[PDB]
Every structure is written in structure tokens, then in C-alpha cells.
């Protein structure tokens, strides 16, 4: 359950 | 020497909480990924919500978290402090929590 960080690379992972 | 915005080892949510009571949409703090073994990051209040930028390293010691990079954490702050952050409005990193030292 992570919100991520605006810039954060896409969730493609 | 200190950290008027950096935190250390806290949860993005904690930064999403101190940013939620903030008042200027721009308030920001930097977090060292509390889930990682040490991943820099930063929360900031844009409009009222708390969006954070992931902080990365160029492998030489530089720090970035959006578009341009720098050679210091507080350096990326001052930069985004005069330069917007989102292409939807003009928000900039600001001071969070701690109130203006001496505010009753």
C-alpha cells in the first residue's frame, strides 16, 4: 500500500 | 547547521501528516524511505494533499527528485523553492511543522 512519489518512476517496476 | 525540512527515518505518511496541517501549499520535508534501508524522498503539500518526490543519487553524490538534479539536499529545496514543482500550478518546497520559531 504505497502512495509513491510524484516523480517516482511509473509503477512498471 | 540543522534540518528545517529534512526528517531522517520517517514514514511518508508521517510527512503526509505534518504536511496536512501546513498552511502554505509548498511546505516540504525530506524522508529517507522508512521502508528502505535508506532511500531519500520528500513530502510536500500541493493544494492540501501531500505528494512526495522520490530522491535518487547520480552515483557520484548528486541528489535529484523530479527533473533537474543538484549536489545537496537542501540545494534541491532552495531550487524548487523558487521554481515550481508541478506543471498544473506554481508550488515550491517550503518549511513544514515547527511553526515560525517563537510563535507563542
Swiss-Prot record, chain A:
Widely expressed. Expressed in neural stem cells but absent in mature neurons. The modification Phosphotyrosine is found at residue 5. It is found in: Cytoplasm; Cell junction, Focal adhesion. Disulfide bonds: none annotated. Phosphorylated by activated epidermal growth factor receptor. Phosphorylated in response to FLT4 and KIT signaling. Isoform p46Shc and isoform p52Shc are phosphorylated on tyrosine residues of the Pro-rich domain. Tyrosine phosphorylated in response to FLT3 signaling. Tyrosine phosphorylated by activated PTK2B/PYK2. Tyrosine phosphorylated by ligand-activated ALK. Tyrosine phosphorylated by ligand-activated PDGFRB. Tyrosine phosphorylated by TEK/TIE2. Interacts with CPNE3; this interaction may mediate the binding of CPNE3 with ERBB2. Interacts with the NPXY motif of tyrosine-phosphorylated IGF1R and INSR in vitro via the PID domain. Once activated, binds to GRB2. Interacts with tyrosine-phosphorylated CD3T and DDR2. Interacts with the N-terminal region of SH2B2. Interacts with phosphorylated LRP1 and IRS4. Interacts with INPP5D/SHIP1 and INPPL1/SHIP2. Interacts with TRIM31. Interacts with PTPN6/SHP (tyrosine phosphorylated). Identified in a complex containing FGFR4, NCAM1, CDH2, PLCG1, FRS2, SRC, SHC1, GAP43 and CTT. Signaling adapter that couples activated growth factor receptors to signaling pathways. Participates in a signaling cascade initiated by activated KIT and KITLG/SCF. Isoform p46Shc and isoform p52Shc, once phosphorylated, couple activated receptor tyrosine kinases to Ras via the recruitment of the GRB2/SOS complex and are implicated in the cytoplasmic propagation of mitogenic signals. Isoform p46Shc and isoform p52Shc may thus function as initiators of the Ras signaling cascade in various non-neuronal systems. In response to a variety of growth factors, isoform p46Shc and isoform p52Shc bind to phosphorylated Trk receptors through their phosphotyrosine binding (PID) and/or SH2 domains. The PID and SH2 domains bind to specific phosphorylated tyrosine residues in the Asn-Pro-Xaa-Tyr(P) motif of the Trk receptors. Isoform p46Shc and isoform p52Shc are in turn phosphorylated on three tyrosine residues within the extended proline-rich domain. These phosphotyrosines act as docking site for GRB2 and thereby are involved in Ras activation. This is SHC-transforming protein 1. It comes from Homo sapiens (Human). The chain holds residues 423 to 435 of 583 of the full protein.
Swiss-Prot record, chain B:
It is found in: Nucleus; Cytoplasm; Endosome; Golgi apparatus. One of its GO terms (biological process) is signal transduction in response to DNA damage. Residues 5-97 form the SH2 domain. GO terms for cellular component: cell cortex; cell-cell junction; centrosome; COP9 signalosome; cytoplasm; cytosol; endosome; extracellular exosome. The modification N6-acetyllysine is found at residue 54. It comes from the Eukaryota. Changing residue 54 to R: Loss of polyubiquitination. Keywords: Acetylation, Cytoplasm, Endosome, Golgi apparatus, Host-virus interaction, Isopeptide bond, Nucleus, Phosphoprotein, Repeat, SH2 domain, SH3 domain, Ubl conjugation. There is a cross-link at residue 54 (Glycyl lysine isopeptide (Lys-Gly) (interchain with G-Cter in ubiquitin)). Non-enzymatic adapter protein that plays a pivotal role in precisely regulated signaling cascades from cell surface receptors to cellular responses, including signaling transduction and gene expression. Thus, participates in many biological processes including regulation of innate and adaptive immunity, autophagy, DNA repair or necroptosis. Controls signaling complexes at the T-cell antigen receptor to facilitate the activation, differentiation, and function of T-cells. The SH3 domains mediate interaction with RALGPS1 and SHB. Homodimer. Associates (via SH2 domain) with activated EGF and PDGF receptors (tyrosine phosphorylated). Interacts with PDGFRA (tyrosine phosphorylated); the interaction may be indirect. Also associates to other cellular Tyr-phosphorylated proteins such as SIT1, IRS1, IRS2, IRS4, SHC and LNK; probably via the concerted action of both its SH2 and SH3 domains. It also seems to interact with RAS in the signaling pathway leading to DNA synthesis. Interacts with SOS1. Forms a complex with MUC1 and SOS1, through interaction of the SH3 domains with SOS1 and the SH2 domain with phosphorylated MUC1. This is Growth factor receptor-bound protein 2. The lineage of its organism: Eukaryota, Metazoa, Chordata, Craniata, Vertebrata. The chain holds residues 58 to 159 of 217 of the full protein.
Amino acid at each position: 500500500d504505497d502512495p509513491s512519489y510524484v516523480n517516482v518512476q511509473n509503477l512498471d517496476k | 547547521g540543522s534540518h528545517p525540512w529534512f526528517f531522517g527515518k520517517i514514514p511518508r505518511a508521517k510527512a503526509e501528516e505534518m504536511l496536512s496541517k501546513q498552511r502554505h501549499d509548498g511546505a516540504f520535508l525530506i524522508r529517507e524511505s522508512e521502508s528502505a534501508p535508506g532511500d531519500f524522498s520528500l513530502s510536500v503539500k500541493f493544494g492540501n494533499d501531500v505528494q512526495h518526490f522520490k530522491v535518487l543519487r547520480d552515483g557520484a553524490g548528486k541528489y535529484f527528485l523530479w527533473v533537474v538534479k543538484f549536489n545537496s539536499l537542501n540545494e534541491l529545496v532552495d531550487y524548487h523553492r523558487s521554481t515550481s514543482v508541478s506543471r498544473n500550478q506554481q508550488i515550491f518546497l517550503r518549511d513544514i511543522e515547527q511553526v515560525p520559531q517563537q510563535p507563542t
